[PDB]
Design a protein around this nucleic acid. Structure first.
Ligand SMILES: [Zn+2]
Ligand SMILES: [Zn+2]
Lengths: 365, 163, 365, 163
DNA sequence: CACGTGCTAGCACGT
DNA sequence: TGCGAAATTCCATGACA
DNA sequence: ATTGTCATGGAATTTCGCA
DNA sequence: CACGTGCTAGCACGT
DNA sequence: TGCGAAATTCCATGACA
DNA sequence: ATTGTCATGGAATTTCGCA
């Protein structure tokens, strides 16, 4: 009872005056429209907000109502929120009510072999004792190569990619941080050939979206063809590879084969509208097409989005949380804002990490 | 007729036997008629069975209107006949003993045949492992006749690995 | 070449006239802005649309472009779409581009014990050799009872519910079609006590939303309390049950305990604003609160939603599709439209089934 | 003082021994002071240990301000003392030998004590299994004094199982 | 014993 | 009355299956 | 024969203290 | 050998 | 020209992880 | 150090055949 001059009519900032503050049972009380509540000293208040909150680690409004059941003080929610900010369990357990920043729509690779996009589909039904598939999608064209493997290992990855790069060598190759892509052994092979390795932020397949989205088309057509018949898929990849590379994307009105070559091969329903033009007048028109291709823009930001600012406190989704364990790591600081969807954090272990904002929540308070 | 285009004719032929590099005694050679683009496939025998296995890889990428070859056994089977038709490729052969492709191909089948041999007793029984690099230079070799390289002609772009 | 009078200037409906239709190579051709295309006879057309489509079972526009590469005929897309309609593989493999009807917001149970909502949380970390929890949520109030079990079996379910119904007997009890709730043995017990069993449509937990949404709060607070300490959760359920039943929902400004009793028990921060009123003046005010409680309404329907009409052809999401198998069962007919989100279908096996439209797609064409 | 409310006082007491129905020899009895609402717990002994185990179930639902009982061993332990305080329940006892609750409770502790015995040598050693039904009627028995039943008083609604 | 409904396990790779 | 500050309420986001 | 739900914390909105 | 990243297995219940 | 029909394009929905 | 993507099929919109 230190700022107690209220009984003596003294005006202390933040305390409305029209209310009479009496004493009773050794507690300063105040008759409010709510009822009569007890005003605890500024020293006790933290201990009470803590006591109340820890009942079910209730959020702001929930924690307040409990408190209001008995007490009144100036600007209750401020003392409340201050604690929610210092509660390690709620901070790391409570989900976020902010959604991510709107997606980037990376510009699409300028020419063939500019960026490759690679992945590993499977395991799948053992067909010819092969369990996996290495998908290789050219960024610019969407041309796709499908290599059956027995394991998602550096071995087969290099083994396929060598065969693939007997055709051409690509500037950069993008992929998830999957076991065999992060391998030093692969890092070698990559560097031997002066190929730049790019890696998607961890636990964020959107970033290997081009492969992944082809992963659908592959898996979908593979399915349509194994209807009412065993899942022997090995002997169908080539069929699928051709079928798919030669399948028109309605937005662009071009097949991935077309954007790579400019001219249809000896495939069915083969298009011959450039049969007149000499190969130069053909190839020329191609660089004209490859430039004016449709490109989607960033969609509108959610009304309740959030954007990574340097130094802001954020937390990283726990990769594989156990049963009944928090889903958020302790809070970390933003070092670099690579872009509105990518962030270098001071990882909890305690490293530098490049993460998608999709695996972050901003720390509340 | 109408202008020469890629995929119009794939000229094929074998090269072998060679020293047993990793167990591969021959090499099936595919060249594009128009771009001169070249595909190399180490096979253990110049057989339809090993040839099909290889042109089955190639035809999952592109399909030529016509495969043109010599009358070597591998290329004139019934098997290779039936294989061609199923895919809609027309088969065409040089008349036996007196071969004939085009200038572009004639030179390339040379380029390869010499580009191979520098690697023969220059690099012992270790040529299999470098077969892809042979291919790469082969496809990035500036053409005097046409101002461009095969890789530029086929894909329409500078290559990232030029020679 | 049957409707061939075009070479003879005759006008056949659907064929623009400004175009000259010549012959060449035994095929009727037509010079178009596109180029020169071949007109196949009305008999051949199906065979061609089929041939084209089956290349990668491409959808409408994708399948057409292939076709347009060589041919022209009146209203191509019609012959195209007709086949997509008769292709058993695409019909059952292709995902849907219509989203469901907007959700219902069921009126909330009028009084306590009107509807119970029950579920089985777990398996979980063996604590005291108990692996599961039976959650029982009163609909009207949100009062919750938590019974630890060793199995999600009729045994423990009845065993708990007997204990629970020593307090009161509920009119109806709702639950997912989980093993132990569909049991005849449970059906008995239920009927013995003249309790009506209700069951959520299959593979649709939204329908047991009240339990499920309490399933969160339970699991979340259970987690906040096992931070940096073993996952022994048995000895914490009671604690959690009290803590939660007595935790204010900010929308309603009431604890589930309050809506059940009208008066706080001897729990911390206990609210005493009705200490003046006699129990009648207390209980009376309660029926007044329980009526004016906030209730959410149906949100807006998506611009591309779809609504179950009787007799319309729809398909049921394959419960657990294998790897590389179609996700849709063959198409079935709507018999009863229970409501804009619930449908009796002629199940594929071939039964009557009550399904959520959330596990249906309307059959395209 | 201020009006009688539910949870204000839980009057407890044992009833036993009884015939060993399924192994349960006693019954811990809890009645609400204001609604007369009654909770019945078969226990194997009238001990604090078995009593705590039972009021631990009850107190996960509601908590009374005061538990009022007789001076029976079970209720006057140090254990039961410490248990009460940890939960903030005030303990209160009748003065020994001359018990005292209220009219409502006095009658209910009777109602139960008789409602039990019809089930005694009316239904042999099979009373455990019907203990919940005893409870249900008990809580749906129309009160003359107060116009309502406990289930109506406590919950504020008609019950679906009225007697 | 396989099926249906409800649930969470688990394994591969390279470091 | 009207103003500035404080308290309330709104609400889309995400997690429960 | 059935039907989504609600704690959450910045942002918006409404109410309060004082003239 | 456990950890990280990438993946899909699998088990319980009652009929 | 302007009309009605046909062809095109738009696009949110869902699946790939 | 990095970044979502595109086939899909009713609905809307733009173009075409013919005056
Ligand atoms: Zn907390
Ligand atoms: Zn199809």
């Amino acid at each position: 009872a230190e700022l107690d001059q209220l009984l003596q009519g003294h005006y202390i900032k933040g305390y409305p005056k029209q209310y009479t503050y009496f004493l009773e049972d050794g507690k300063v009380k105040v008759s409010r429209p709510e009822g009569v509540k007890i005003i605890p000293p500024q020293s006790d208040r933290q201990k009470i907000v803590l006591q109340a909150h820890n009942l079910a680690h209730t959020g702001r409004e929930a924690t307040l109502l409990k408190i209001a059941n008995l007490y009144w003080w100036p600007n209750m929610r401020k003392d409340v929120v201050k604690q929610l900010g210092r509660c390690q369990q709620c901070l790391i357990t409570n989900a976020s009510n902010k959604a991510s920043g709107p997606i980037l729509r990376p510009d699409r690779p300028q020419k063939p072999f500019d960026k490759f996009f690679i992945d590993y589909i499977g395991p799948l039904p053992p067909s010819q004792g092969y369990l996996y598939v290495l998908v290789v999608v050219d960024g610019m064209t969407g041309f796709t190569w499908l290599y059956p493997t027995k394991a998602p290992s550096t071995s087969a990855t290099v083994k396929s990619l060598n065969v693939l790069t007997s055709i051409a060598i690509p500037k950069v190759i993008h992929s998830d941080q999957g076991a065999a892509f992060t391998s030093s052994t692969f890092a070698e092979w990559a560097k031997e050939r002066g190929i730049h390795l790019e890696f998607s932020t961890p636990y964020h397949p959107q970033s290997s979206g081009k492969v992944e989205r082809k992963n659908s088309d592959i898996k979908r057509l593979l399915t349509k063809l194994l209807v009412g018949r065993p899942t022997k898929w090995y002997d169908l990849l080539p069929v699928v590879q051709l079928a798919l590379n030669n399948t028109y994307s309605p937005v662009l009105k071009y097949t991935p084969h077309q954007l790579l070559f400019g001219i249809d091969s000896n495939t069915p329903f083969a298009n011959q509208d450039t049969l007149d033009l000499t190969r130069e007048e053909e190839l020329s028109l191609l660089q004209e097409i490859r430039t004016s291709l449709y490109h989607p823009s960033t969609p509108p930001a959610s009304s309740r989005s959030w954007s990574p600012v340097v130094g802001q406190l954020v937390q990283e989704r726990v990769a594989r949380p156990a049963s009944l364990r928090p889903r958020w790591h302790k809070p970390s600081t933003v070092l670099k804002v690579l872009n509105p969807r990518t962030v270098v954090i001071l990882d909890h272990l305690g490293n530098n990490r490049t993460v998608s904002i999709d695996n972050l929540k901003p720390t509340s308070h | 007729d109408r202008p020469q285009k890629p995929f119009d004719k794939f000229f094929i032929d074998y090269i072998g036997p060679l020293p047993p590099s990793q167990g591969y005694l021959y090499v099936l050679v595919v060249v594009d008629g128009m771009t001169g683009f070249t595909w190399l496939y180490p096979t253990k025998a110049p057989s339809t069975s090993a040839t099909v296995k290889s042109l089955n890889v190639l035809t999952s990428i592109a399909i030529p209107k016509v495969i043109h070859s010599d009358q070597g056994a591998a290329f004139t089977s019934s098997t290779f006949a039936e294989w061609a038709k199923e895919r809609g490729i027309h088969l065409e052969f040089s008349t036996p003993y007196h071969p004939q492709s085009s200038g572009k191909v004639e030179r390339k089948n040379s380029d390869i045949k010499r580009l191979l041999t520098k690697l023969l007793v220059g690099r012992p029984t270790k040529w299999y492992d470098l077969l892809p690099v042979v291919q790469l230079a082969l496809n990035n070799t500036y053409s005097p006749v046409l101002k461009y390289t095969p890789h530029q002609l086929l894909f329409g772009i500078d290559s990232n690995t030029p020679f």
